[PDB]
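New to this. Help decode the following:
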Amino acid sequence: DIQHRIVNVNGLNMHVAEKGEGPVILFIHGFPELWYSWRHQIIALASLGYRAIAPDLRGFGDTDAPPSVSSYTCFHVVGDLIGLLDVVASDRDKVFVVGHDWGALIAWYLCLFRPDKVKALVNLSVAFNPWNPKRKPLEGLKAVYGDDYYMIRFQEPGEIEAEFAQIGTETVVKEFFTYRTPGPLFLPTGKGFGHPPNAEIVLPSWLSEDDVKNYTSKFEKGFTGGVNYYRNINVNWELTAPWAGSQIKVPVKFIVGDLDLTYYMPGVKDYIHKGGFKRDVPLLEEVIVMEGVGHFINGEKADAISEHIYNFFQKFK
């Protein structure tokens, strides 16, 4: 059975799911995800000699959610993870890391700030984000996509929360998790996802009703914690100028589905395939583009992702 604990990390109570013995694999979920999003990987790794550790991030699930938006920079979350490793894996020099979506971003920062703590990295969906002095990220995103782009809609405090409350938690969860468009997600102002009211949402074969119930029971407490991550995008950029020109010093395996919208953000495809990714991440071993796979690749292709994780981390035994 998967073990669940509440652990105090420098005053932040974090919910940690854990299973197995052996080398530590730290799973970092994204938005709007939880530890639950790694459950298959937690099993399909614990039964292979690894100690899978998946926390609810700051502001998610059963982890404490600080009320201020200023408490959700990348530094706060990476510090949470460093303290968590010091509490539950103190006798471990380095750990393995697997990230997805915002988690992937966090993983990048974790490898950027503390490469001494990471043995190898498997990141999903989101490729590395080299610091760019020319333009703030939100400004470029808005210049390409406009004000109804979901990351822009998330910025003003309270607005997207009001729209989500109008839509209902379960419907919001389904709208996010069943998304399969290889393009920008638009949230028309005052109209939610811009879909007819009480329309049917057909769940894919990898997402069950019980998964939706698990996500809904946790996000009924609020989406603000996860949205604050997006609300700190420009803050992260403004505070990460010290790492202009930095290189990730960690072996990395990157996996993404060719229907994932993040794969089609400005310049991402050329960055991954035309040499910039390999330049910024010198130990990037392989890039895996799965055909016909969407954003939630660790859920849509659970066994394949588990096998990729295991095969990559076996090269460092």
